[PDB]
């Protein structure tokens, strides 16, 4: 059934699985028209397809041309997400295809189920987890490749950099959800923390700074604080 805190270790077993997050597929700026009406202008989007075990991110860039002349865009975005995920699965060798796809939003279940009819043994699951994958576009290199794209593109990243050399997939996913939760709650504060010291750099082939195990503790500590500050304000408690 639904993925929750009760079955959280299933994420790091040796059954191939993928999270799908559609919250940055259809993105708009709302603006005023010359006649003083309101209008939307689409920007490039992306599907966030992650293996939580490996950190292998399949970033399908959704170029604004896909929306041209189409109606009910937020509905179409779910179906276009499920089309692209179905296309990714079919493109992988059998031994690489997932056994489970966990959608981060229940509205993606029927579209994904219908696009995956051809794959009856792949389980489409919702989650009760509130995952901060929306903040994926606060990661500078992911934001850059989406916004530069002039056509539909798939870009492959490892969202854990080289962390799996030193830490387990459970600990890598926890670190990643803490960074994304921080970037989602206060993007300015989160980025300040990550780059406040000039001597710690991001390798060309990486997304996050090259922190030592000690520096990661300090960083993780600073991110936890930032999330509570903001929570203590939102709710004045």
């Amino acid at each position: 059934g639904a993925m929750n805190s009760s079955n959280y270790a299933e994420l790091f077993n040796n059954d191939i699985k993928l999270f799908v997050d559609d919250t940055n597929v259809y993105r708009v700026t709302v603006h005023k028209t010359f006649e003083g009406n309101v209008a939307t202008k689409a920007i490039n989007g992306c599907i966030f397809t992650l293996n939580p075990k490996t950190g292998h991110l399949f970033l399908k860039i959704i170029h604004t041309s896909v929306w041209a002349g189409q109606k009910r865009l937020s509905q179409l975005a779910k179906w276009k997400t499920a089309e692209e995920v179905s296309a990714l699965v079919r493109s992988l060798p059998k031994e690489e295809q997932p056994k489970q796809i966990i959608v981060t939003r229940k509205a993606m279940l029927d579209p994904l189920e219908v696009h995956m009819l051809d794959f009856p043994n792949i389980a489409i699951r919702p989650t009760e987890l509130r995952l901060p994958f929306s903040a994926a576009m606060s990661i500078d290199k992911l934001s850059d490749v989406v916004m530069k794209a002039t056509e539909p593109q798939m870009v492959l990243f490892n969202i854990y950099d080289d962390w799996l050399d030193r830490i387990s997939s459970y600990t890598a996913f926890s670190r990643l959800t803490l960074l994304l939760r921080a970037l989602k709650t206060n993007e300015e504060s989160a980025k300040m923390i990550l780059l406040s010291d000039p001597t710690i750099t991001i390798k060309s082939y990486h997304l996050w700074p090259s922190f030592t195990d000690e520096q990661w503790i300090t960083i993780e500590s600073q991110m936890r604080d930032l999330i509570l500050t903001e929570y203590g304000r939102k709710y004045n408690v």
């Binding site: 179409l76 499920a82 089309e83 029927d110 579209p111 189920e113 219908v114 696009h115 009819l117 051809d118």
Partner: protein, 300 residues
């Protein structure tokens, strides 16, 4: 006007004939039902006084042979059987009529209710849904499951309704996933009407048989088939005008006839709210929407 004689009534029982019912006392001198209208399918149905569980009955047409009811004290139920000896049957019926041991099918002359509920139901189509080819009549009860309920476990006691599944390769064309899921017109018109049913008359016959089985026997899988067949039309953007007009009339008489007190278990809130208020045909069922709102505003 045709007759279904009863050999006897050894156990106390509520006897149904179509939309009517009569209580018979244990060993009451009851010998059957006369004046049964020729031209329609009929259903004779039973609910024992001692065990008010397992409603069961027989679908029959009097044109297709001479049928009687005889209690079997081994299997503990009223059985339908065919009498092949025409002169023996007429001799039995005439005797019981002379002795006035038979209730008359109590049809009011103005009242088209049974005709309206059975308009498209044909014995030949019932005998393909209820497979038992050595009998001209069909046995249904409360508990019988559908071919579809079995897949999701005795094939010979199954109701073989047409399987409808909105998230099936049958319902969804590769490359038209969103189109076909949101607008069932291809599934309704090409796959079900042209391909499987051949015409709307066969589709409506099965829908009406499904309803009557739900109503008379509280057959759950029958209720599911009735709603699925309503949803498939209502969820289609493109439906022949004559089918929408006819569906409105069919549904009106099913809602009109439904015992007021069973609407909680016999009617599916999600399906009815969608069909009347959200679907492509939200504006296309005036009669059904007006009776539903006046008789069952709770559900909506």
């Amino acid at each position: 006007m045709n007759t279904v004689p009863f050999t006897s009534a050894p156990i106390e029982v509520t006897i149904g004939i179509d939309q009517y019912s009569f209580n018979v006392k244990e060993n009451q001198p009851f010998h059957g039902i006369k004046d049964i209208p020729i031209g329609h399918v009929h259903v004779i149905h039973f609910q024992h006084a001692d065990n008010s569980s397992m409603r069961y009955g027989y679908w029959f047409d009097c044109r297709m042979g001479n049928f009687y009811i005889q209690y079997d004290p081994k299997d503990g139920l009223y059985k339908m059987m065919e009498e092949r000896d025409g002169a023996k049957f007429e001799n039995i019926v005439h005797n019981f009529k002379e002795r006035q041991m038979m209730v008359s099918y109590p049809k009011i002359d103005e009242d088209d209710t049974w005709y309206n509920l059975t308009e498209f139901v044909q014995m030949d189509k019932i005998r393909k849904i209820v497979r038992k080819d050595e009998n001209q009549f069909s046995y249904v009860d409360s508990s019988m499951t559908t071919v579809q309920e079995n897949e999701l476990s005795d094939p010979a006691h199954s109701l073989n309704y047409t399987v409808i599944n909105f998230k099936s390769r049958e319902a969804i064309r590769p490359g038209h996933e969103m189109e076909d899921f949101l607008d069932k017109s291809y599934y309704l018109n090409t796959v079900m009407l042209q391909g499987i049913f051949k015409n709307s008359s066969n589709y409506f016959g099965e829908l009406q048989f499904a309803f009557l089985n739900a109503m008379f026997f509280g057959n759950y899988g029958s209720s599911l088939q009735w709603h699925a067949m309503i949803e498939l039309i209502c969820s289609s953007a493109t439906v022949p005008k004559h089918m929408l007009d006819k569906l409105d009339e069919i549904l009106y008489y099913q809602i009109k006839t439904l015992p007021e007190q069973y609407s909680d278990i016999l009617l599916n809130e999600r399906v009815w709210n969608i069909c009347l208020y959200s679907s492509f045909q939200k504006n296309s069922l005036h009669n059904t929407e007006k009776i539903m709102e006046n008789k069952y505003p709770e559900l909506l």
